[PDB]
Structure 1
Amino acid sequence: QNPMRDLKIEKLVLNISVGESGDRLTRASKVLEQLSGQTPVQSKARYTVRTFGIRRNEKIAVHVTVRGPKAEEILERGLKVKEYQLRDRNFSATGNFGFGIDEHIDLGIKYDPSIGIFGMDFYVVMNRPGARVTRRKRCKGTVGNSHKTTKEDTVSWFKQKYDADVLDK
């Protein structure tokens, strides 16, 4: 039936792939903590490509995870920017999804020219409760087949709440 299989948000991950190290990386870092109330983390580049101008381990991007009520309200504050209007092919085949935006100042931080103007990529991890089965240490196990998330489940949920719409396909 449907006693407690209710879908819910795990985590909002906030990503910025600023292509270079140094000051503009530092400023990128100084963007998120205001938005997140939370300190960010920096990821290194794991092999040179020499066309994007990157070396091994020269620390390119910044991303954060947020969960719970603060995560859902910030999600809402992003979907307001995107006017509740998302394309089907954005959705993961597992039931995850995500999108991107530009001009982070179009929400929250006014301009603060010392910081600059940056775009982000939000990505949402979605599931049902009872998920710690795959995450605890003792007696680790996988989730049942019927109990996973799906394209259809997540799009239907996204329909019914936020009363939003999905595009062409």
Structure 2
Amino acid sequence: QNPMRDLKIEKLVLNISVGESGDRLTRASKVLEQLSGQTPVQSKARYTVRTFGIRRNEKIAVHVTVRGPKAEEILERGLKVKEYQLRDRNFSATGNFGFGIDEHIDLGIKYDPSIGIFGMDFYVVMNRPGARVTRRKRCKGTVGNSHKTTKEDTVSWFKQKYDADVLDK
């Protein structure tokens, strides 16, 4: 019984885990920039491993958060690449979902060898309306069980829209 329990997309965050800092990262950053239109954010390394050749606070990654119609736009632009085919996995038991795509040129974006080719992790966080209770300052509360996102309920929404796919157990 839902006249307002209609599943919107909260945000879509794109993430390039460029394993090191430098030119490669400022390039993946410029890609994210002309994929979002918003200045992306850089991520520093938490600790140091040295097998991955990284260092604490190395600024080894970039991401960008996009919400609304623009997010639906890029979401579809990537769904095409993945042929509208996902798996029973890839979905959080909490309702959200995401995929990954190497070959970032499949998103319309041209080649431009002065930047190279890069991969990207796509993560879509979904939520019904009134999710503001958990994110506001005053009276911050928890949404009812029946009202928050579910994994089966989200895959059902995903299939209904774009009829894309489920594909396995």
TM band (smaller chain): over 0.9
TM-superposed CA distance for 1:147, in Å, is 1.0
TM-superposed CA distance for 1:108, in Å, is 2.2
Contact 1:35 1:108 (8 Å CA) reproduced: no
Cα distance in 2 for partners of 1:5, 1:66 equals 22
TM-score normalised over the length of structure 1: 0.98
Cα distance in 2 for partners of 1:113, 1:145 equals 49
Deviations 1:74-127 (A, max 9, x none): 101110111110011111111110000011112222111100010101000011
Q: Percent identity?
A: 100
TM-superposed CA distance for 1:162, in Å, is 0.8
> Alpha carbon RMSD of aligned pairs, Å?
0.8
Match for residue 150 of structure 1?
150
Which of structure 1's runs of 4+ aligned residues deviate more than 2 A?
A: none
Contact 1:90 1:97 (8 Å CA) reproduced: yes
Cα distance in 2 for partners of 1:10, 1:110 equals 28
Match for residue 50 of structure 1?
50
Cα distance in 2 for partners of 1:26, 1:148 equals 38
Cα distance in 1 for partners of 2:68, 2:49 equals 38
TM-superposed CA distance for 1:38, in Å, is 1.0
Q: SS of the residue aligned with 2:30?
A: helix
Q: SS of the residue aligned with 2:147?
A: coil
TM-superposed CA distance for 1:168, in Å, is 1.1
Match for residue 94 of structure 1?
94
TM-score normalised over the length of structure 2: 0.98
Cα distance in 1 for partners of 2:124, 2:106 equals 20
1:60-139 correspondence runs (5 A):
60-139=60-139
TM-superposed CA distance for 1:18, in Å, is 0.2
Decide which moves more: 51-60 or 100-109. Answer: 100-109
Deviations 1:35-88 (A, max 9, x none): 111111101001000111111101100000000001101101110111110011
